[PDB]
Nucleic acid binder design. Structure first.
Ligand SMILES: [Mg+2]
Ligand SMILES: [Mg+2]
Ligand SMILES: [Mg+2]
Ligand SMILES: [Mg+2]
Lengths: 133, 133
RNA sequence: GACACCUGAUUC
DNA sequence: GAATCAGGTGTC
């Protein structure tokens, strides 16, 4: 109910859905961009939302940080929880790159450990998420 | 598409949104101003766009004119089509006047008949609408 | 129902 | 940068 400022905020950005997807992670307190993914040709909002959290996880683990992660995506939070992204995006030559990243994400989620709390950003109370595009 | 010069062009003009709104109708061919609404204290762009078309309709009917009407407003064209303006503007003492006009507009749209074609001005091909402020 | 992502047309 | 509307997609 109270914003935990000592945290990382992620968000996806896109042009079309499915369409070009990118995502980044910033410091919730300052908004400093800590990581940003190079635009992927084709992917869904949710896939991008998902990859943003997994990426955030790896990023905190590499810096031995116990800060939680904020995502406004109800779908991605669950996918991360079950360590399983359940996307409908067709698998083919076009969407080959996003699916690569996605499979890798899940692989990492199963070959690694973390205690990082994954929090739901309450847009309906606090406004847009800090990493919002 | 070919521009139908034998027609009426309407547009809204405002200061803030919501804010002070006004609108006028001109001859598409010459730009002659055929009617102009006295500035309303508070209203939205779309409400002003909507009122501009309905006013245009009454204006053509009174002169027994079958000329079509041009509006660049996707929202207003649909509102006129359903004879129902779906605005979010709060209803209260401040916005009392604009809502009056709007209610009256819809009332007129239901107590009257017309064949007047309502055309979408293709700004992305022809430039600004002739009644543009 | 809910959480998101845009797309488009406008208004400043 | 910020507000007003309509349409369409990805998911729980
Ligand atoms: Mg998001
Ligand atoms: Mg966002
Ligand atoms: Mg207009
Ligand atoms: Mg204009």
């Amino acid at each position: 109910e109270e914003i935990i400022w000592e945290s990382l905020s992620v968000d996806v950005g896109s042009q079309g859905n499915p369409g070009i997807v990118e995502y980044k992670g910033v410091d919730t307190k300052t908004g400093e961009v800590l990581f940003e993914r190079e635009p992927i040709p084709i992917g869904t909002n949710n896939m991008g939302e998902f990859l943003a959290i997994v990426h955030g996880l790896r990023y905190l683990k590499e810096r031995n940080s116990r800060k939680p992660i904020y995502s406004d995506s109800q779908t991605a939070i669950k996918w991360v929880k079950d360590k399983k992204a359940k996307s409908t995006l067709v698998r083919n030559e076009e969407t080959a790159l996003i699916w690569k990243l996605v499979d890798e994400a899940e692989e990492w989620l199963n070959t690694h450990t973390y205690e990082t709390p994954i929090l739901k950003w309450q847009t309906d109370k606090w406004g847009e998420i800090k990493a919002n595009y």
